[PDB]
Point group: D2
Chain length 116, copies 4
């Protein structure tokens, strides 16, 4: 799994389940092209977004729909989404885990990058 | 101050000085219109971005050039930038402080929203 | 200010007001000796904890009563308290700002250390 | 696994490997009794600290030796350790994952609490 996203809920102390996210890749004309999308599982994880062959060098954006998550819990949050923009694979293939820890007015995000 | 941004360095335990950022506002066609910009002071703060009259309801994006900050310290960071996307002023004017705490592979952000 | 503590609420997007904390200093027998205390102001800040002359080399512990803060909001939090343990003044006086960003099941803390 | 701890490195974008930690439980006389200890694996995880039978209701403290971790990388960090103090199992048995995201002058920590 070259790209995995894990989302945690800092209010409830749980994985953030059924969180939608969209991945984009910067095109040659500097526009954001749709790349992949999905929803987190009961473990707060989204696996299977891409493959080694498809996940080429580039600038990628993961846009996590935190707003819908909070609104479904009756909370009016601050952010429209949490987004993570990064260059991937520019020194050869790597495995990326993007983690996001969510609160209504705050988020933290980190990356774990491993060389297979 | 209708909109202030404060940036902190989690590696050195200091304000993040001379950090550049642009602020955009979403246009009716979903493109990002230039709205404000600047760089952080020696206190890690950027004041004077906008005025109360100009800062009306909209979706705003603060795009913080964290990559240039880390590169100046000889550190190859994960993110291209840190971005904070939020609706502002939908219930009339508020004062917004956006804080960002930076590490090479991670950032945390929070908002303090106060009614004038 | 030799030692200041700032506390933020990640659920409500506000300073964390009226948050109680005690500061201890490690004694020669490894017990924690009372050193300072107070509660945060309407700005979420606690100033005036110590003076430069009294604040010498030692291991200090700031114990922030986050549990009482969340319980006052009807929220059952995870932590008994947030604690920040650090050596201070080992290279002579410095000014320390300890910031804590609170959620019910999570907290983040950072330090800003400045040379007078 | 009733208690698991996961530690991540925000500077290097990696699991925090070989991080020592000590777990204590508050005794009837309000002292901290040694409860368990171990070191994180190559995945940054420490499993097997305790068992369902041993992990009774109580106040627990996880003290993560972040100082030695940073010093081994040539970094003089701010904190002596990162500590997590919490009541466990007071409504019946739960499974706890404690996560900590480490930087030299900052740490974030969260808990995921699940009912088996
Ligand atoms: O506490 C810490 C930890 C750590 O990993 C690095 C530093 C200092 C970094 C640094 C790099 C380049 C430069 O021109 C100046 C600097 O201070 C301080
Ligand atoms: O943006 C958010 C999110 C969220 O989950 C809760 C709040 C407000 C909480 C609250 C609770 C008790 C009280 O007396 C006052 C309060 O404001 C605001
Ligand atoms: O651990 C963390 C995470 C994070 O996202 C922010 C902070 C501190 C933010 C901050 C905001 C306003 C202000 O006047 C001062 C501040 O330090 C601390
Ligand atoms: O306090 C924080 C802040 C933050 O941004 C992330 C975490 C947890 C991240 C995480 C990453 C990979 C994984 O397999 C599991 C995880 O829990 C904890
Ligand atoms: Na290359
Ligand atoms: Na409105
Ligand atoms: Na010294
Ligand atoms: Na009980």
């Amino acid at each position: 799994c070259p790209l995995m996203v894990k989302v945690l809920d800092a209010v409830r102390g749980s994985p953030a389940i059924n969180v939608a996210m969209h991945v984009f890749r910067k095109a040659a004309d500097d526009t954001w092209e749709p790349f992949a999308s999905g929803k987190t599982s009961e473990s707060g994880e989204l696996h299977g977004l891409t493959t080694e062959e498809e996940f080429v060098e580039g600038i990628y954006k993961v846009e996590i729909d935190t707003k819908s998550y909070w609104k479904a819990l009756g909370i009016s949050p601050f952010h429209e989404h949490a987004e993570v923009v990064f260059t991937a694979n520019d020194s050869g293939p790597r495995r990326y885990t993007i983690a996001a820890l969510l609160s209504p007015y705050s988020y933290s995000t980190t990356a774990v990058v491993t060389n297979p």
